[PDB]
Amino acid sequence: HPMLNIAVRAARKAGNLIAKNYETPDAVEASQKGSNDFVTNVDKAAEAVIIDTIRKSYPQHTIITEESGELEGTDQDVQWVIDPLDGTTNFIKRLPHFAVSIAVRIKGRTEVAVVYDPMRNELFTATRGQGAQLNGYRLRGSTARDLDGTILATGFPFKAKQYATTYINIVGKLFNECADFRRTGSAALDLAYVAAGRVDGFFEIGLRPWDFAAGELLVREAGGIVSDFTGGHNYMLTGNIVAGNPRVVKAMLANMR
Amino acid sequence: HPMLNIAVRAARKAGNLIAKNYETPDAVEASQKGSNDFVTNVDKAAEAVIIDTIRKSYPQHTIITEESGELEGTDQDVQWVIDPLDGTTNFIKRLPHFAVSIAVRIKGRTEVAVVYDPMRNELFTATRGQGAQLNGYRLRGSTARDLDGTILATGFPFKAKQYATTYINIVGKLFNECADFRRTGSAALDLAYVAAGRVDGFFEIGLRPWDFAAGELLVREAGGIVSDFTGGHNYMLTGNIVAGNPRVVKAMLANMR
Ligand SMILES: [Mg+2]
Ligand SMILES: [Mg+2]
């Protein structure tokens, strides 16, 4: 795919910049969008690289990014949904777990996806109908058949703490069944880890379209399922995400019911 | 220090073996000690390398490991406390976050400590009175002065689920004050991340002496504090650990009170 090629180039170019800013934390300094949500010059500098790169082969495509909103082009049938740095808190604390997320949707259907870990040099790619890969290895997800002994990735609603006590409950009910959780601070990498089988499932409240647009396709092409907290497909409206293989999502949702 | 030198060699040698078994997951297969606690041939194979290495320069020292218990020597004034692979669940799932933990105690006082991430090639070292380093960079911990906006590492009691509901409460009370948590699956690396400032604090219930013997010294020589859940120093008996800089541990314990 020609569009997959461009996405990997922009992801790798932006990943190279983010990495170098990590090993040389000379000029990084933050800025507060919301309570406990931050922006850095490295976010916008890597965002500029992604836009620039996309726009030498397709600057007529609409580009939707977290930091600049919708920047529509002439061809509105194709839309790049970009997260320049998923895991900004981790980056500021110099916790080396973050990634570049790039998704392409064609008239409302995601065709390609890229999640790139610059610190580990791990490249997750997906193409619709053509499977999902990690550095050239096809991903099949987790062979888990129930919630017994499962490791579940998740995130806390530090952007929507009005649902704090609701989230705490859901964790305990799941903890009553599952073995452990993982809280990594990167939703894109959490979804990539579900598709790779490094964890068994994922759930978070109120994600943002660019947080999961690429990661959702990784899970689906690894044989997985994505849904909202009530089993429906209206998570593009809500940002309430449940992801995993069919039985786990099944068992996860039954526990949630 | 001559003993620090040997500890790094055994950590790196065992780390090299664990790494190679990760990139070539040919022969790994697990075994169940307790519910949701596993052993692999790679644990004991790396444990054998550590014992062998320690025992070419000091086989008269007592060695305490998770998988073999106490193997006492003639000189019982010095004791190596070894975790060959902290993060075994992560290793089986091929989640690349684990480490080798090696601590040396001399008549009951920890003199040296090593935590080695083989996947990231990150070497955390500490020597009593001589500071803590990461790949030759001295660590000072987190400059956080309260719990506002803090990232706290923690673990779930999947080995002692009788305290599940007590742990869930404590998380919610802390979540009422702090921004987010991190759940990585490696207590040794969590403690190393507290000393490096990648996270701001740590708390877990019922850890095991080799889980934290090396990591505790990393925090202390980074200017940090370790205590039990009631502010005392009787955590060698309990395994209930709170770690961070003095104000955070202070603020963490006040929230816990
Ligand atoms: Mg972002
Ligand atoms: Mg271990």
Numbering used by the authors:
A (entry chain A), B (entry chain A): 2 to 258
Original authors' sentences:
Ribosomal RNA synthesis in Escherichia coli involves a transcription complex, in which RNA polymerase is modified by a signal element on the transcript, Nus factors A, B, E and G, ribosomal protein S4 and inositol mono-phosphatase SuhB. This complex is resistant to ρ-dependent termination and facilitates ribosomal RNA folding, maturation and subunit assembly. We show that SuhB directly binds the RNA signal element and the C-terminal AR2 domain of NusA, and we delineate the atomic basis of the latter interaction by macromolecular crystallography. The SuhB monomers are folded as an alternating stack of three pairs of α helices (helix pairs I–III) and two β sheets.
About 1600 Å2 of combined surface area are buried at the dimer interface. It has been suggested that wild type (wt) SuhB might form monomers, and that the R184A mutation stabilized the dimer state observed in the crystal structure of SuhBR184A. We therefore also crystallized wt SuhB alone and determined its structure at 2.25 Å resolution. Isolated wt SuhB crystallized with one monomer in an asymmetric unit, but a dimer essentially identical to the dimer seen with SuhBR184A (rmsd 0.56 Å for 482 pairs of common Cα atoms) and in the SuhB-NusAAR2 complex (rmsd 0.49 Å for 497 pairs of common Cα atoms) was formed by crystal symmetry. Moreover, SEC coupled to multi-angle light scattering confirmed that SuhB forms dimers under the chosen conditions in solution (experimental molecular mass: 60.7 kDa; calculated molecular mass for a SuhB dimer: 58.3 kDa).
